[PDB]
């Protein structure tokens, strides 16, 4: 993917509203669309509400998510069986 010489890509507002309660009491779920931003260690503990197209479905960021994208953990298609 992106490169060694470019960084990770995080969408510039998924950090500010996360580094805005840097030192705060509690964690309320964060309302997102940016499924495309990578996950830093900083998020560890957060439960974001990402967008899978019609509903914000929530997942809580843990420490085995810490190299992934935000939207690998939110289905877009629905398929129960044939």
């Amino acid at each position: 993917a992106r490169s060694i010489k470019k960084g990770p890509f995080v969408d510039e507002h998924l950090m500010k509203k996360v580094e805005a309660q840097e030192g705060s009491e509690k964690k309320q779920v964060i309302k997102t669309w940016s499924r495309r931003s990578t996950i830093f260690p900083n998020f560890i503990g957060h439960t974001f509400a990402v967008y899978d197209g019609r509903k914000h479905v929530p997942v809580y960021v843990t420490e085995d998510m810490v190299g992934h994208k935000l939207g690998e953990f939110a289905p877009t298609r629905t398929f129960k069986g044939h």
Partner: peptide
């Protein structure tokens, strides 16, 4: 994982 991330980049 957390350590791997920082190592690859610089953080």
């Amino acid at each position: 994982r957390v350590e791997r991330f920082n190592k690859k980049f610089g953080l």
